Amino acid sequence: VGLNNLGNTSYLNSILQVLYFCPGFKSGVKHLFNIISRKKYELICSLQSLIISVEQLQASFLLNPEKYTDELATQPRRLLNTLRELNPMLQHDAQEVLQCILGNIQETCQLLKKGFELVEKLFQGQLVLRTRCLECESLTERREDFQDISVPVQEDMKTLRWAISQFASVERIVGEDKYFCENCHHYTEAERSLLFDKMPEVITIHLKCFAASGLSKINTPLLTPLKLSLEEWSTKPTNDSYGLFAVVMHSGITISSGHYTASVKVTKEYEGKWLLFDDSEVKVTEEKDFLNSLSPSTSPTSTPYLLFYKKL
Amino acid sequence: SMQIFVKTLTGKTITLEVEPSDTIENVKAKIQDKEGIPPDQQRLIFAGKQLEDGRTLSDYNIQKESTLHLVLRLRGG
Ligand SMILES: Cc1cnc(-c2ccccc2C(C)C)nc1NCc1ccc(-n2ccnn2)cc1
Ligand SMILES: [Zn+2]
Helix, strand or coil: CHHHHHHHHHHHHHHHHHHHCCCCHHHHHHHHHHHHHHHCCHHHHHHHHHHHHHHHHHHHHHHCHHHHHHHHHHCHHHHHHHHHHHCCCCCEEHHHHHHHHHHHHHHHHHHHHCCCCHHHHHHCEEEEEEEEECCCCCEEEEEEEECCEEEECCCCCCEHHHHHHHHHCCEEECHHHCEEECCCCEEECEEEEEEEEECCCEEEEEEECEEECCEEECCCCCECCCEECCHHHECCCCCCCEEEEEEEEEECCCCCCCEEEEEEECCCCCCCCEEEEECCEEEEECHHHHHHHCCHHHCCCEEEEEEEEEEC | CEEEEEECCCCCEEEEEECCCCEHHHHHHHHHHHHCCCHHHCEEEECCEECCCCCEHHHHCCCCCCEEEEECCCEEC
């Protein structure tokens, strides 16, 4: 169809498909849109236009699938125009696009303040970074915000729990990377560990599916679980667990080009299924079937790149 | 002047000796010396914000034990 041009911005489409199905994101955008309307800002205005456009498409898809194909091709130019205005960025990185959109919304909220905490409540957490000098055994702490967790995918079949351990478990920095202890006034070996203090509603895992010797893409994925618990690396005991609801995958043999696809979970009959977005095509999938396709044992061509977990 | 940490592509932490007045491109040159990744292919994230070239470390309130996260660009379209 005429929607074939959708493929060019597949980095943006995957991020906007994930944000549309995030719990509370489109409610937060509407709340900001209402405030801006009576204030009389383009990012909020174009986002609300996109959400209404998708809402009309989604409603038609549910009720009359035959006329969904017609309406999807009735005015494709309208949909493509709002994506050109909404693009915050060639071929680009999906995680970088998400960082730009979320940063733009955050700046609008802060400027509007001077409901206004949409990004912070949804995507922003807090880390506690501890360093322990192996000579004097003194502890120094740093507090840093985070919006997403960057974990490795190979050591240099592995699970996501191994990847987070590489991120947050105690690491010993030695040799050329000796810590400089102010107490010892000397270079000493040290142990670094990361802990989660404040927890966002949505947990984003940025998989480093790329390596350096010269840069190459790692096609082998990790064993992604449906349930995620961060109690192993948390400052306090928490019974809160997280469930996977969105996956952004990258197809290609290199890091310099490829295609982005997004798989999201519906939260009727469709509730509990996974929607696979491929340019202009949408496929409803069972949770059992989608998870098998993610298995590294099947050698998927689409490499998982971003995982999204919502608090239960 | 101060020693910051960088988490590399494999999750391993390396250390950098930098100045508060150091530009971002200067830090990327220091990372290339230890990791071998060209500065144009590097993305540095501090406290959830990507560090843009032309700014300095003092602009981002980067202190001694601050941790930068090093990621690449996985381009797609
Ligand atoms: C073809 C297509 C591709 N992208 C998107 C889309 C979705 C969300 C946010 C942004 C976008 C685009 C515009 C960037 N939407 C599409 N089609 C509409 C649609 C929507 C929902 C469903 N659906 C089925 C069961 N629950 N919802 C079915 C069809
Ligand atoms: Zn010491």
